[PDB]
Amino acid sequence: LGFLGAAGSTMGAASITLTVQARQIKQLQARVLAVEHYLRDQQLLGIWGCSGKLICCTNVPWNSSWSNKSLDEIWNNMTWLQWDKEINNYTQLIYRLIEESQNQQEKNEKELLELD
Amino acid sequence: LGFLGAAGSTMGAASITLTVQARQIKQLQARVLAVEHYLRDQQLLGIWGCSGKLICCTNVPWNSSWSNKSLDEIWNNMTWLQWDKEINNYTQLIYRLIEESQNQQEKNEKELLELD
Amino acid sequence: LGFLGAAGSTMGAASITLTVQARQIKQLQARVLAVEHYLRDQQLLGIWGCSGKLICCTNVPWNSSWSNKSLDEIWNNMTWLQWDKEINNYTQLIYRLIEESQNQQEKNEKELLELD
Amino acid sequence: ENLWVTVYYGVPVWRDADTTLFCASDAHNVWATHACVPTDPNPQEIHLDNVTEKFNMWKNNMVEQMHEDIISLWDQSLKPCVKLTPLCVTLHCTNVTREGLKNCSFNMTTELRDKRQKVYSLFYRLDIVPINENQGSEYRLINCNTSAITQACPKVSFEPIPIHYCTPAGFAILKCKDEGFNGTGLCKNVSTVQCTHGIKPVVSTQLLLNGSLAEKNIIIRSENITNNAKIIIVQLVQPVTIKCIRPNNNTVKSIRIGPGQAFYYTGDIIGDIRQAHCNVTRSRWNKTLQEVAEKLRTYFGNKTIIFAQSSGGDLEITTHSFNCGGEFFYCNTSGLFNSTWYVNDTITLPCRIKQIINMWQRAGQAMYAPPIPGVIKCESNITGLLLTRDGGKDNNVNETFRPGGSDMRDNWRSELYKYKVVEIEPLGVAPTRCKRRVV
Amino acid sequence: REGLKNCSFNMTTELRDKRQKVYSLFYRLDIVPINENQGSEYRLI
Ligand SMILES: *[C@@H]1O[C@H](CO)[C@@H](O[C@@H]2O[C@H](CO)[C@@H](O[C@@H]3O[C@H](CO[C@H]4O[C@H](CO[C@H]5O[C@H](CO)[C@@H](O)[C@H](O)[C@@H]5O)[C@@H](O)[C@H](O[C@H]5O[C@H](CO)[C@@H](O)[C@H](O)[C@@H]5O)[C@@H]4O)[C@@H](O)[C@H](O[C@H]4O[C@H](CO)[C@@H](O)[C@H](O)[C@@H]4O[C@H]4O[C@H](CO)[C@@H](O)[C@H](O)[C@@H]4O)[C@@H]3O)[C@H](O)[C@H]2NC(C)=O)[C@H](O)[C@H]1NC(C)=O
Ligand SMILES: *[C@@H]1O[C@H](CO)[C@@H](O[C@@H]2O[C@H](CO)[C@@H](O[C@@H]3O[C@H](CO[C@H]4O[C@H](CO[C@H]5O[C@H](CO)[C@@H](O)[C@H](O)[C@@H]5O)[C@@H](O)[C@H](O[C@H]5O[C@H](CO)[C@@H](O)[C@H](O)[C@@H]5O)[C@@H]4O)[C@@H](O)[C@H](O[C@H]4O[C@H](CO)[C@@H](O)[C@H](O)[C@@H]4O)[C@@H]3O)[C@H](O)[C@H]2NC(C)=O)[C@H](O)[C@H]1NC(C)=O
Ligand SMILES: *[C@@H]1O[C@H](CO)[C@@H](O[C@@H]2O[C@H](CO)[C@@H](O[C@@H]3O[C@H](CO[C@H]4O[C@H](CO)[C@@H](O)[C@H](O)[C@@H]4O)[C@@H](O)[C@H](O[C@H]4O[C@H](CO)[C@@H](O)[C@H](O)[C@@H]4O)[C@@H]3O)[C@H](O)[C@H]2NC(C)=O)[C@H](O)[C@H]1NC(C)=O
Ligand SMILES: *[C@@H]1O[C@H](CO)[C@@H](O[C@@H]2O[C@H](CO)[C@@H](O[C@@H]3O[C@H](CO)[C@@H](O)[C@H](O)[C@@H]3O)[C@H](O)[C@H]2NC(C)=O)[C@H](O)[C@H]1NC(C)=O
Ligand SMILES: *[C@@H]1O[C@H](CO)[C@@H](O[C@@H]2O[C@H](CO)[C@@H](O[C@@H]3O[C@H](CO)[C@@H](O)[C@H](O)[C@@H]3O)[C@H](O)[C@H]2NC(C)=O)[C@H](O)[C@H]1NC(C)=O
Ligand SMILES: *[C@@H]1O[C@H](CO)[C@@H](O[C@@H]2O[C@H](CO)[C@@H](O[C@@H]3O[C@H](CO)[C@@H](O)[C@H](O)[C@@H]3O)[C@H](O)[C@H]2NC(C)=O)[C@H](O)[C@H]1NC(C)=O
Ligand SMILES: *[C@@H]1O[C@H](CO)[C@@H](O[C@@H]2O[C@H](CO)[C@@H](O)[C@H](O)[C@H]2NC(C)=O)[C@H](O)[C@H]1NC(C)=O
Ligand SMILES: *[C@@H]1O[C@H](CO)[C@@H](O[C@@H]2O[C@H](CO)[C@@H](O)[C@H](O)[C@H]2NC(C)=O)[C@H](O)[C@H]1NC(C)=O
Ligand SMILES: *[C@@H]1O[C@H](CO)[C@@H](O[C@@H]2O[C@H](CO)[C@@H](O)[C@H](O)[C@H]2NC(C)=O)[C@H](O)[C@H]1NC(C)=O
Ligand SMILES: *[C@@H]1O[C@H](CO)[C@@H](O)[C@H](O)[C@H]1NC(C)=O
Ligand SMILES: *[C@@H]1O[C@H](CO)[C@@H](O)[C@H](O)[C@H]1NC(C)=O
Ligand SMILES: *[C@@H]1O[C@H](CO)[C@@H](O)[C@H](O)[C@H]1NC(C)=O
Ligand SMILES: *[C@@H]1O[C@H](CO)[C@@H](O)[C@H](O)[C@H]1NC(C)=O
Ligand SMILES: *[C@@H]1O[C@H](CO)[C@@H](O)[C@H](O)[C@H]1NC(C)=O
Ligand SMILES: *[C@@H]1O[C@H](CO)[C@@H](O)[C@H](O)[C@H]1NC(C)=O
Ligand SMILES: *[C@@H]1O[C@H](CO)[C@@H](O)[C@H](O)[C@H]1NC(C)=O
Ligand SMILES: *[C@@H]1O[C@H](CO)[C@@H](O)[C@H](O)[C@H]1NC(C)=O
Fold first, then answer.
1. CA gap B45, E16 in Å, rounded
2. Gap from D77 CA to chain A (nearest CA, Å)
3. How does DSSP classify residue D66?
4. Labelling D16: which of A67, A115, D309, D410 has CA 20 to 30 A away?
5. How far is C-alpha D133 from the geometric centre of its chain's CA atoms?
6. D367-368 and D150-151 as β-strands: parallel, antiparallel, unpaired?
7. Between the CA of residue D394 and those of A28, D301, D399, D400, what are the distances in Å?
């Protein structure tokens, strides 16, 4: 299909192609910038505990205030471009909640291991 | 709290905020330096097998010469700033021991799979 | 032992030292280049699903046309330098096969996530 | 119990560090602020509870970086500008008919290499030195024997713009919030910012203008209050307004030196010729001196506090230099520092204007400011003083202080005293009962 | 000796309108005779 070839497809269809898209003086600035973008995204995944995965489930419940749409209304009826606009104002809030959940999870894993 | 807001808090209390600090021509030099700074610590985590984790338990036993303090004396009676000073002379020693232990673990898991 | 002190040792002996080598306008360009080489290898490990591991087993079968040597003939009778030369023309084939095997694994993982 | 090493990431610790800082500013100025990163519309500051930290304004390397950046920006602004090397030519001068000005004439080059033109211009006596022939009619520009002279571009403003200093990610700037602080010792109230508040570049030699004000009381700062060699920085609670004027109405004319070049000079003065001056309100200044003396007495054993004018040295040392309207003023501050304070209208300061300056005192460098036409007026706040102690005396009766300081860095310190740069180290290790499980 | 020559030139001065006569010694290796080859005039090699 190729890079971004799924952009006009539904979110559910697009989720199949994530593997493909995970890949891929002024030159110096271009090289530094390319590195910063790669690491920016990886830093978030590492903090979330999602590193190494294209699809990562979390323990954060969905707030109906972020969207009142059913899963079918989202996965089979939307492009990711449309979806990002719908939650553009809630994305940072969601990110913080994921991070808090990861830290609570690892603290609990530690306390469990203390019993062994 | 906020960035480093936990710095004066006890080591145990501070652990709830780990994600807060985990995230985050001269301008170009600043950007490159920030990348090198970030990667330095991520490289150690990758070697230690701790990548993707905020809290990572190891197989290295604590040597009482590094500190003779009880867990209450450390976790409920210290800041992380004070702790780093106490073991500042042993930090690199500890780091090498973690690396040696990880490599033996990687080897042992390989051998287990070879048998199975 | 020190950096690359294992280079003349057998591959099996060398495997115990992997963490030793895992560590580490012209000046600015050199710093960016060093980062790119580090990340180049880390991206390959992420593509292969081997990120965070010093030793990573794959599902790709050894193809005897690359080498007909027995494991004892490889692990105890050769250095890594000699080994790289013996299969130098096949390394790209191996890397591509590892990526293909990971792609199949990710498709299977996606189904499992929906099932449970 | 058997304890094991546990690795933590995101640990809230830091160590003192020196790192490259970059400029940021609010969305042609000499400081090239357009090159700077736009400031955050809502800057963050985090108070650090239970944190006490050691600061030392005299060892602070933010100051060294600011000084290098101020010089580097200044030099960059002069690179495209017109060189005045052809103007180092014998001048023939007579009185304008005040002593501060001479009416000079000379032969200068033209757009065409083979042609010459006669130029009449007025110069300040400070920029003019007699030729060793000593006939009294022949003169040269004062820096022709020490440096090339470059004309500042007329399009470039020297007006200060606040500059925020920012640190790279992974580093942070600590700020001291104590109500009073000497810039040294432990600060009880510490907060963290990514960037400093904006700091205006200000160039001055005796008085600090338009700086930060003390919240409650006058703060006197020194590396060693008992060492007369050290420069004492005094921060005022309330500003004292100083107003400056250049009464002369200059008519600025332009003559080509050569292709792509032009020279700007005052060709005429309209109306009478009067000396430039600055005034400080007497009542407000007197209150300021008394309050400074009251604070000094707490360090010096309640000895009578004496202020006095500088003992000597270059004009740049003995007078108060500043940039007003793009003109460089040098004012006689003896009107401000003539008092004696026992334990028990306005002040007019004469000024001089000099077009050729050496702001950083570097050998081999000089700048010629172009004249600014018309009458120039300025207003600024005196927000602090640079004082030195007159030592070598064993007298227990009284003590004497004089204005001025050894370096430009002393000005930068007055705003940066509260800031410290630290490196953030997210990794750390500590014992736990937790043991890693192995497959 | 033969390795040196005593040369003179009109050098510029701190002031553009003035000139000074300068005497100096140069090594023969740094000095080239005028193309007229009269030996009375020289230039830097
Ligand atoms: C900067 O440094 C300072 C100094 O180091 C740090 O402060 C220290 O912080 C720790 C951690 O918070 C405090 O320890 C905790 O202390 C409380 C007990 O204190 C209580 O009793 C007070 C009694 O006084 C009156 O009020 C009672 C009301 O019933 C009356 O009966 C009395 O007669 C008196 O009138 C009471 O006043 C306190 O309430 C007030 O003060 C507290 C202070 O923290 C405020 O929050 C309140 O809002 C209020 O202003 C308070 O009730 C212990 O109870 C704590 O132990 C519990 O929590 C621990 C948290 O780690 C936990 O480990 C323990 O196991 C225990 O948890 C148990 O109880 C919980 C109750 O909710 C359960 O939920 C839990 O499951 C479990 O059962 C703890 O010991 C230090 O006292 C405090 N030191 C000082 C000198 O103040 C400060 O934190 C640092 N700042 C930063 C940012 O780091
Ligand atoms: C760009 O946008 C368009 C519009 O959104 C989008 O097209 C929609 O694609 C979705 C699938 O992603 C379609 O929904 C499915 O349709 C399945 C097939 O039903 C009919 O269409 C078949 C052909 O569809 C494919 O090929 C056409 C081009 O030919 C293409 O447009 C389609 O997108 C799709 O690629 C056709 O073969 C099939 O045949 C029937 O009718 C003929 C008539 O002659 C008859 O002879 C046959 O015997 C038979 O009766 C029929 O015509 C349908 O099976 C599918 O439901 C199954 O799969 C889903 C998903 O796994 C399961 O959930 C479900 O339970 C079933 O198993 C589903 O309904 C949708 O219909 C398209 N919309 C339109 C208007 O065509 C493109 O894909 C987008 N492009 C990209 C790159 O994203
Ligand atoms: C540079 O190159 C040289 C030559 O290759 C290397 O020297 C070899 O080092 C390896 C690893 O240490 C040696 O392998 C071991 O040799 C032992 C030799 O036996 C000792 O004891 C007998 C008496 O019982 C003596 O006669 C003999 O001289 C030795 O003192 C073997 O016993 C070992 O076998 C055991 O370990 C192996 C590996 O785990 C097991 O597979 C066996 O079953 C058994 O448990 C082992 O073979 C090798 O012999 C050395 N060669 C020589 C000629 O001495 C250097 O190490 C290399 N340097 C570097 C830095 O790589
Ligand atoms: C520094 O102080 C001097 C003295 O206070 C200020 O000069 C004063 O300026 C005013 C306004 O120009 C003068 O008023 C004028 O007086 C003349 C007569 O002298 C009169 O003819 C005019 O109509 C007008 O009334 C005032 O005389 C003058 N004082 C003196 C002694 O010359 C000067 O402005 C001050 N500088 C600053 C920056 O404030
Ligand atoms: C300083 O000197 C300059 C001249 O070098 C003075 O500028 C001149 O001022 C006169 C008025 O005094 C101007 O004439 C007026 O022009 C306006 C234009 O709208 C007109 O409406 C008036 O009727 C009158 O003609 C003259 O143009 C102006 N010259 C220039 C080049 O602008 C200036 O006023 C002097 N400043 C002081 C404080 O005296
Ligand atoms: C700023 O203004 C004051 C007041 O007009 C000037 O004060 C005068 O300064 C000169 C030195 O530059 C003093 O001359 C000295 O007198 C002492 C004896 O008192 C003698 O020992 C020295 O060798 C020298 O001759 C002069 O007395 C003094 N005038 C007054 C009334 O105190 C000051 O010079 C001005 N500063 C500058 C840089 O122009
Ligand atoms: C601060 O200033 C005082 C006064 O100059 C310094 O005290 C001098 O210290 C030297 C040390 O050799 C003695 O020989 C002098 O006799 C001291 N002078 C007096 C007047 O007591 C002090 O050293 C300075 N502090 C620092 C850190 O430089
Ligand atoms: C410093 O103070 C002295 C006085 O101690 C000033 O000299 C006075 O000048 C005024 C005005 O001419 C006279 O009325 C006084 O009688 C003078 N005093 C003496 C003792 O002669 C001197 O002008 C002051 N300096 C400055 C810069 O203001
Ligand atoms: C500060 O005190 C010194 C020392 O007393 C003063 O210098 C003295 O001045 C008196 C004037 O009568 C003389 O009698 C003394 O002989 C002087 N002492 C020395 C050591 O020379 C100085 O004048 C005082 N300063 C002020 C502003 O009053
Ligand atoms: C949903 O969002 C609203 C608005 O931020 C918030 O007040 C509410 O607590 C949220 N619900 C949950 C379950 O987080
Ligand atoms: C404990 O630490 C001390 C100091 O580094 C060291 O001498 C000693 O050998 C260590 N003990 C062990 C078992 O490593
Ligand atoms: C093994 O490698 C050879 C050479 O590339 C290739 O022809 C052969 O098909 C490979 N075998 C398998 C099973 O992939
Ligand atoms: C091991 O490899 C070396 C280098 O190719 C070779 O000389 C030696 O004969 C090999 N040993 C065996 C047993 O094949
Ligand atoms: C001009 O003033 C100077 C002193 O500054 C003096 O020597 C000269 O003679 C004066 N010229 C006339 C014409 O008075
Ligand atoms: C200002 O101070 C002087 C002493 O230095 C004093 O004589 C004068 O009265 C003061 N002026 C006012 C208005 O208080
Ligand atoms: C100087 O002080 C006055 C006091 O009213 C104030 O209004 C003005 O803003 C101050 N100027 C500066 C540059 O701070
Ligand atoms: C210097 O200039 C004079 C004329 O003023 C000329 O005669 C002489 O030859 C010149 N010297 C040189 C070395 O050109």
1. 69
2. 22
3. H
4. D410
5. 38
6. parallel
7. 63, 13, 10, 12
